[PDB]
Design a binder for this molecule. Structure first.
Ligand SMILES: CCCCCCCCCCCC(=O)O
Ligand SMILES: CCCCCCCCCCCC(=O)O
Lengths: 252, 61, 238, 277, 238, 277, 61, 60, 61
């Protein structure tokens, strides 16, 4: 049975009895930087099991009127164990990441989520005449959510779902590494993202390599007396984490 | 010279169809476009799964 | 020097030419090549990727997820057409914006089959059978299930396998068709009906969502490079 | 060579083979074809995806900028052109480039310079052919502040001298980016404190381009309009993405207004009756 | 004659072209070549030569040898930063004019390591240990020795060997950086502190001069030819 | 070929090896690299110093002179150009050449000639294309004193005839210097008594260059501006030297005004805080 | 003819990259620049010492 | 470049010339050739076919 | 190069008559006309009969 699967990274292990295979980035699997592609001359540090493990973020509640959510990495993991510590003390970073979104219900509930990883998910502002604030793009492990209607915020992100806050069609986000969580068949979604960037390495605070978006295309629904609380938890584990440029920790 | 004969794109009188080329400049950036590179691998986007899925079989089992 | 005679078309500038030209930056050391994931070689690699189709594109949903929702209900609905649309990958408002159609709009000619994947998003207890039919140009759109059933159809049985593919074969007179399809290069229509019905147990929703995906097959191809009519401006941006 | 797949002849069927059934939840795009869901005939398909190549797709000169500069020093008219090179002010080419996240390629740049004589009551002249000068100034180089600035000496900066009447000036340039690939999208900032510039402008810096008339002066006011054209060649693209849906507002960011997913119609079952004998 | 078609860019004049052209002086007998000492092949041969750096470039010393002086004194000075500056070989006012930086200004791109050689010019009786640190971009400039010590540092012990090299490794994200460095292509900072202190015998100066030298390594290289912004005029000289 | 050195992977250390310690007094520039003062990783550096070549550095057309000459003989306007060839009147190119003491190379000379019609109330004309004549006169040759002097016969002196509209005239010249190499600096005199001329002008003598309109006369006054461009090729340079710091004052000597070593700043410990969340 | 094929500078599509050249003029001064001469010897300026100095050793002893 | 001398008739346009010229549509995939009945190679193939002659071509 | 020598059309001094050709463009549509294809088969229009008819014989018998 390919339904059941097990994931093991570091001192963490995830279990599943209702998965749907595993999407591996753009056909590639996380790998350390090679010598014929490196730029930083200093010998990198590789904490390995210390940083490459499963980090669970704050759960989110899926409601009949939920429009979606989104996280930005590696920023969202700035306060996660040693992975966040290396981000502070190092100028350059490089990691893989294994996204694992969980969400279970019952054979009597219905709904369908879209777990996607969007590289360089540059987003727009609510007020097209103004700019956006980092605080409105990503706020730690705290998820930002999409709205079923237009937003008005000064420096807020245009959370209107239909445009995914990028000025595009949500139905075309399938062009990015993704999976769906169709409650009647699924229970979770896993995506192994390889380091994608136009540079061997990059800062992890200044640059948001990719954005994880969970947009429901099939509204959550159910009958009376059926558990109304359906949470959606996101777990991610860095892979082949390398760091360069060691210096005094950065004051957030 | 360093002439290099290639094949031309089919004409409206098919079913001497080759051209000659020589680079005159020292920089590769000066050369003409590579309109004849026909490589493909949709797998990256259409089948980026870890476990090979056989068409004639159930996606899940 | 060598006696030469200039031919017509000299000194002109054709945006689609392809000649050699002196480099303004001699001996420039290009930045080392880096193997980046997900490289694209042919645009068809994109048009072959399934993308959600906004079948329910009614004025009231042009900006909501309901545009993608294709409701199905329990109870007698025989003779009722769940949905329908023309087969214009680049002209039909339903496909016009999908990854597939979005690319076709950069070309004037197209050819090949299309894969319409349907996914049932109801509960694991809901069951049912739908009739996905495709009728080639020539006659009026199927008004009844019998008429639709006479054409290329697929009877989808909802079960563990959530999705079901309705491959629309390329049944054209000419080898290619215009993205800006007219009556001459008509492709036909696609109508969905209830083969049986959607039965459901007590304490379970009666309305379910059915998503639609569209993508090109291994026999698809575009041909006439043109500019897309989905982008323009009135002055230089700033 | 770049041929399309042929259709194998298929006959009746009745087995446990379920090529039509699948599960999109896996993120896997069905690889089904007509022969899998019906009886098909053998067809030797000779069609080719030769024009779908990223090379043939992007390798076509497209206008990226346009400015006007005058000859005489009358009023507050600019006598020279200035431009912070980038392809985000022309929606057409900008939309194509944005189909991919990263790009790498050399480029052929062509200039279409045209002049004219501004209207007037008494404007009888006899001006010789107008010669123009286009100078590229990479980030950091000295910028001219007049049509007689020393910067126009073009000691080391690449520059072109063209006289009207002749074929539009052209010249190729390699892959300038200091990175391993040009970036169309940068979901990051310019400063580590996560502020300052956000997006493209945060890292892209191809320098500036200046133009002017090398002619001293014209009896009566005249103006010229230079149009810059880009034609990438020896192309490489990575990470495809959803095409632009909302109209472009600014050329510095991706701001947009909530746009409709697509055009509307009567109902989900609406299909125009085109057969009416 | 041979049918020819002129391509765009004909009859133009690009200052960086490279074609053949008729000699105005046919069969001219060039003066015999003479082997002259110190021939230059690549400009990098110059940027690799140490040149005194004006670290003390304060308004009052912009025209005196004090601009190169980096004083160090005897007595407790713990927690005190001897000096500091950004790592902008071509933009930083400190390097901007050195042989190295002076050359980088003819280019827009640069890459490689830099050798900062420090020479103690005090008396033969003076002793001491200095901490030469280099912090890559990302955090605020080291306010204390502890903060600076966390980065790439070198503890220089003054002795018979007058000079000490602090090689600043190329730790960048991108392969190249702009000479006209911005925040994106930041390189970091270099701060000097007192590891211990400068002890001295009786009848010996208490203030000493420490010269700084800067040069490129064998892994350095420039790339984008441009005009230097350190020279101009308002009219033809006479 | 012109590749850069790679960085060998280095590990911990604890020996009597002192690569970091040295003595500049020897006049020897430290040959240390990152791997000598820290732990480094192996890096296959593919960068190339191909554009740092003295050839690629100096081989770029740079303006060296510019003068204006009129067509009609009205007032005291010069109808022809005269110029004592040298590259010391254009700071840009002059500064590069002066990075080295001696130079040897052939040269590509390009001319950008443009004309115009001086302003007026009634200046309606119909002048045919203007043809120009540039004549080089090596030291000693007869110099023309008018636009109709016999010297323009160009019996043996090299000369170019160019008509407006066509591509800017060009032509190469070998290594003229009577010495084994051109001299950018001459710390000596022209006379043995240590007086007379001092420096460049004391020995350099590339002759003169004259220009004019071959057209007899224009109905109304018109003027042309010729710009001379130099592009050394097949270059050789010796004895490098400190780049020019003080602005150029005269084109005959190295006179200068006490200039600052560099820009100022708050203090030796001043470093702008660019991180402010 | 006296054609001479050389190697072009790397392009933006690496990891037929050669050009042909023929001199038409009788004077060497007419030929194009030598943009491909990559010789080096910094020793003249960086290490013009009479006694070889080994990096890993003391400059003076 | 290669010293060239333009001969008379340059830049002209003769309707019956026959030179090469850049394609405005690079790498266009021409529609597969189909063997259609009754192909003509030479116009004489037509002039060799009998056709009724209007010998009685009087005004009426 | 990929030169291809063919035969020229008879001149007004008949009874070195060949030319050379090289394609410079990548598309066959760029090549010159095929003014030298002399194929014929009038049978299609002059004798499209099912039963071969011998000239020296009666059309019907
Ligand atoms: C000599 C002119 C130089 C012009 C440089 C143009 C560089 C274009 C780079 C486009 C980058 C992008 O589209 O992401
Ligand atoms: C035919 C025109 C001849 C012009 C001769 C120019 C010679 C330039 C020599 C430059 C000498 C120097 O820069 O030290």
């Amino acid at each position: 049975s390919d339904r059941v699967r097990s994931l093991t990274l570091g001192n963490s292990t995830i279990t599943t009895q209702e998965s749907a295979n595993v999407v591996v980035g753009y056909g590639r699997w996380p790998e350390y930087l090679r010598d014929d592609e490196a730029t930083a001359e200093d010998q990198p540090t590789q904490p390995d099991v210390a940083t490459c493990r499963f980090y669970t973020l704050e759960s989110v509640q899926w409601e009949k009127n939920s429009a979606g959510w989104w996280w930005k990495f590696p920023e969202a993991l700035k306060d996660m164990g040693l992975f966040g510590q290396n981000m502070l003390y190092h100028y350059l970073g490089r990691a893989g990441y294994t996204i694992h979104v969980q969400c279970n219900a019952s054979k009597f509930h219905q709904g369908c989520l879209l777990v996607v990883c969007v590289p360089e998910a540059e987003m727009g502002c609510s007020q097209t005449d103004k700019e956006v604030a980092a605080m409105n793009l990503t706020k730690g492990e705290a998820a930002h959510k999409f709205e079923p209607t237009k937003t008005n915020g000064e420096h807020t992100v245009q959370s209107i779902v239909c445009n995914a806050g990028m000025g595009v069609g949500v139905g075309n986000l399938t062009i990015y590494p993704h999976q769906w969580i169709n409650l009647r068949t699924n229970n979770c979604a896993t995506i192994v993202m390889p380091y994608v960037n136009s540079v061997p390495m990059d800062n992890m605070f200044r640059h948001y390599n990719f954005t994880l978006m969970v947009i429901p295309f099939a509204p959550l629904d159910y009958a009376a007396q059926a558990s109304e609380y359906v949470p959606v938890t996101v777990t991610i584990a860095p892979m082949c984490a390398e760091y360069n440029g060691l210096r005094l920790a950065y004051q957030q | 010279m360093g002439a290099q004969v290639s094949t031309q794109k089919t004409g409206a009188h098919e079913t001497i169809i080759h051209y000659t080329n020589i680079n005159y400049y020292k920089d590769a950036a000066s050369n003409s476009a590579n309109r004849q590179d026909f490589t493909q691998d949709p797998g990256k986007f259409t089948e980026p799964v870890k476990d090979i899925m056989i068409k004639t079989m159930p996606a899940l089992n | 020097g060598l006696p030469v005679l200039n031919t017509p078309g000299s000194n002109q500038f054709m945006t689609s030419d392809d000649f050699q030209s002196p480099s303004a930056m001699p001996q420039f050391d290009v930045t080392p090549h880096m193997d980046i994931p997900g490289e694209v070689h042919n645009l068809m690699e994109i048009a072959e990727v399934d993308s959600v189709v906004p079948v329910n594109n009614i004025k009231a949903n042009l900006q909501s997820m309901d545009a993608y929702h294709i409701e199905v209900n329990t109870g007698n609905y025989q003779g009722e057409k769940i949905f329908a649309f023309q087969m214009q990958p680049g002209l039909e408002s339903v496909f016009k914006r999908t990854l597939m159609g979005e690319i076709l709009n950069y070309y004037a000619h197209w050819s090949g089959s299309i894969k319409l994947t349907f996914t049932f998003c109801g509960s694991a207890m809901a069951t049912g059978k739908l009739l996905l039919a495709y009728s080639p140009p020539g006659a009026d759109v199927p008004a009844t299930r019998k008429q639709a059933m006479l054409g290329t159809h697929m009877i989808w049985d909802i079960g563990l396998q959530s999705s079901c593919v309705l491959c629309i074969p390329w049944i054209s007179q000419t080898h290619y068709r215009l993205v800006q399809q007219d009556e001459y290069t008509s492709a036909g229509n696609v109508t969905c009906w209830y083969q049986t019905g959607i039965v459901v147990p007590p304490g379970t929703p009666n309305k379910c969502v059915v998503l639609c995906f569209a993508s090109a097959c291994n026999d698809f191809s575009v041909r006439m490079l043109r500019d897309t009519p989905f982008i323009g401006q009135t002055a230089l941006l700033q | 060579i770049a041929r399309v797949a042929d259709t194998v002849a298929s006959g009746p069927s009745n087995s446990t083979s379920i090529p039509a059934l699948t599960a999109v939840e896996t993120g896997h795009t069905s690889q089904v074809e007509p022969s899998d869901t019906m009886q098909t005939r053998h067809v030797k398909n000779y069609h080719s995806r030769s024009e779908s190549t990223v090379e043939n797709f992007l390798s076509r000169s497209a206008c990226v900028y346009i400015e006007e500069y005058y000859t005489k020093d009358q009023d507050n008219v600019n006598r020279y052109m200035s431009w912070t090179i980038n392809a985000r002010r022309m929606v057409q080419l900008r939309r194509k480039f944005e189909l991919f996240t990263y790009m790498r390629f050399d480029m052929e740049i062509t200039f279409v310079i045209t002049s004219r004589q501004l209207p007037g009551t008494s404007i009888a002249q006899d001006m010789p052919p107008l010669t123009h000068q286009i100078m590229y100034i990479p980030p950091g180089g000295p910028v001219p502040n007049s049509v007689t600035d020393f910067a126009w000496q073009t000691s080391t900066n690449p520059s072109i001298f063209w006289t009207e009447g002749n074929a539009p000036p052209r010249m190729s340039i390699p892959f300038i980016s200091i990175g391993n690939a040009y970036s169309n999208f940068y979901d990051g900032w310019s400063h580590f404190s996560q502020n300052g510039v956000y997006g493209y402008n945060a890292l892209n810096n191809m320098g500036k381009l200046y133009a002017r008339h090398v002619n001293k002066d014209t009896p009566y006011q005249m103006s010229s309009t230079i149009r810059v054209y880009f034609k990438p060649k020896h192309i490489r693209v990575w990470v495809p993405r959803p095409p632009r849906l909302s109209p472009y507002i600014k050329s510095s960011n991706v701001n947009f207004n909530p746009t409709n997913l697509t055009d509307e119609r009567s109902s989900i079952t609406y299909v125009p009756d085109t057969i009416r004998p």
